[PDB]
Structures are given as structure tokens and as C-alpha cells.
């Protein structure tokens, strides 16, 4: 997260860390949607152009975390994966269309003060909340700058980071990139003339873009951190998987399995 700040403890109790076993590294963010299901980006697990193809045995899911590096003995839960599901029409070749994946935990997790699921939106919520100019929130343990001086500069945060970004009009999204954007994506970020900055960055991928409803007080996941061109560049915007447009797939997978 570029130009964000430290999360408060328990601020994002649905934030999940995807953790590689060997070598030990942070792979991606994710979010908890029930006691046995985790939602992430497809490209966190499968991207053939860089020979990335992770398996149930390659990964751990860590839930309830605040610090990036500590083993938070009292608070975090570490789970193994039973099964990974990737959208059948995930397009890694040209534009990362349908960048979405589900993961089933081997055992259910107990909720607590630090572990709690986020709501997925219904039709009325999606139509009300997903409008240009409205602000959502992104969280993650990814990089603090696009680039920094080796062994001197900052790089990675020590605790979870948070930033609030406005949804941007579809025509401005289109003009800003040569990539063919579909209706399964939206873009967020400040415009060059607005004087505030912020973006997701390497390692934030797969994390939730969430919005709060003022009428019932609940948090909804509207997006998944998907892709961008660098981090926090002027005239550039991050792109997010459109969670609602893909809800029917989620529904199929959870119901059948």
C-alpha cells in the first residue's frame, strides 16, 4: 500500500495472508467470507507467463494477523488448504479478465475479535454503492513504494496498511491504459489534479476492496486487488475484480462443494 497508514488492531478482521511454505514469503492478500472459504485473485495462484502454478500443498493461509512478520501466537490461526477453484474463463493471456479464485480450508476456523467474515453484496447494495466518486478501502502488507534504494529505503511495512480510494468513472479508466478492460473490472484512485495519492502495490494483490453501508452498518467486499501499471503513478489507476458481476460463479462453487 502506497501512501496509506497503519491499520488499527482488528480493523480488518477478514484480511487473510497467503503464505508460501518454501521459500517462506508473502504471496498475496485474500479475504475470509465464511468459516471455510477464502476469496482471492486467480493470478495469485496461476500465471503461466512466469511459470506460476501453486498447489494446495504449496501454501498456508494465515488469518487474524496484524504484524507482517511476527508469529502472533495468541491471535492468528494458520490453516491448510483442501481445494483451490479458479474461474474457468480466467483470461491470463490478454487482460486478467475474471481474476478470481476460491479456496476451501481443510478445517473451519473459530471466529474471534480478530477473525470475522466480510459480507458479499446483493444487487441493491452493488447498484447503490458502486458509483464514481464514492470511496472504498484497500488493505494489505504489500510494498510501500514502487521502487526504493536497496538495503536503505523502506520497502515493506511492519504492520497491515490501509488506504481509502475513490471509484473512478469508466471512461477515465478506459483512457488511462492500452489494455482492453471488461465489465468484470473497475478502477479506483485519485486523479492527478485532486492532490491526494494512494494505491495498492506488489504483495497487496488478492486483497479486498471494501465499502461500508451507512444503512445497516455492514462492510461489503466490492472488489479484489487485481492489477495496475506500477504503483501510485500520475494518470494511472488500480484495477479491481468486480465481485458482484461474478457472484453467480461463487454461488455455484460454494453450493456444489
Amino acid at each position: 500500500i502506497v501512501e496509506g497508514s497503519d491499520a488499527e488492531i482488528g480493523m480488518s478482521p477478514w484480511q487473510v495472508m497467503l503464505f508460501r511454505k518454501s521459500p517462506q514469503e508473502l504471496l498475496c492478500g485474500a479475504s475470509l467470507i465464511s468459516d471455510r472459504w477464502v476469496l482471492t485473485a486467480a493470478h495469485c495462484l496461476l500465471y503461466p507467463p512466469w511459470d506460476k502454478n501453486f498447489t494446495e500443498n504449496d501454501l498456508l493461509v494465515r488469518i487474524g494477523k496484524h504484524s507482517r512478520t511476527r508469529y502472533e501466537r495468541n491471535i492468528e490461526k494458520i490453516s491448510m488448504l483442501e481445494k483451490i477453484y479458479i474461474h474457468p474463463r480466467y483470461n491470463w493471456r490478454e487482460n486478467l479478465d475474471r481474476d478470481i479464485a476460491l479456496m476451501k480450508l481443510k478445517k473451519p476456523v473459530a471466529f474471534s475479535d480478530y477473525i470475522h467474515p466480510v459480507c458479499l453484496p446483493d444487487r441493491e447494495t452493488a447498484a447503490s454503492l458502486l458509483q464514481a466518486g464514492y470511496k472504498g478501502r484497500v488493505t494489505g502488507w504489500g510494498n510501500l513504494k514502487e521502487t526504493w534504494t536497496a538495503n536503505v529505503g523502506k520497502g515493506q511495512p511492519s504492520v497491515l496498511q490501509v488506504v481509502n480510494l475513490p471509484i473512478v468513472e469508466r471512461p477515465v479508466c478506459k483512457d488511462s491504459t492500452r489494455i482492453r478492460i471488461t465489465d468484470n473490472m473497475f478502477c479506483a484512485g485519485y486523479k492527478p489534479d485532486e492532490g491526494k495519492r494512494g494505491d495498492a502495490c506488489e504483495g497487496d494483490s488478492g486483497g479486498p476492496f471494501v465499502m461500508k453501508s451507512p444503512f445497516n452498518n455492514r462492510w461489503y467486499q466490492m472488489g479484489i486487488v487485481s492489477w495496475g501499471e506500477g504503483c501510485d503513478r500520475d494518470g494511472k489507476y488500480g484495477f479491481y475484480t468486480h465481485v458482484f458481476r461474478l457472484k453467480k460463479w461463487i454461488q455455484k462453487v460454494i453450493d456444489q462443494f
Binding site: 488499527e8 475479535d113 451507512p214 455492514r218
Partner: peptide
Amino acid sequence: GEADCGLRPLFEKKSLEDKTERELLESYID
């Protein structure tokens, strides 16, 4: 009924608000 969701045990459930959530709510009324 429907499983509880999106209500944080340390915030909504104790009527406390986080440091920057007001920024999100205000964006709705501009």
C-alpha cells in the same frame, strides 16, 4: 438465519469507529 458478517467485534459491535471510516461515509454525501 443468515450468518453475521461485516460487523467488526472491536468496532461496530462496541459502537466504536475507526480513525478514517468517516472519510468513506462523507464520500456518499457530496
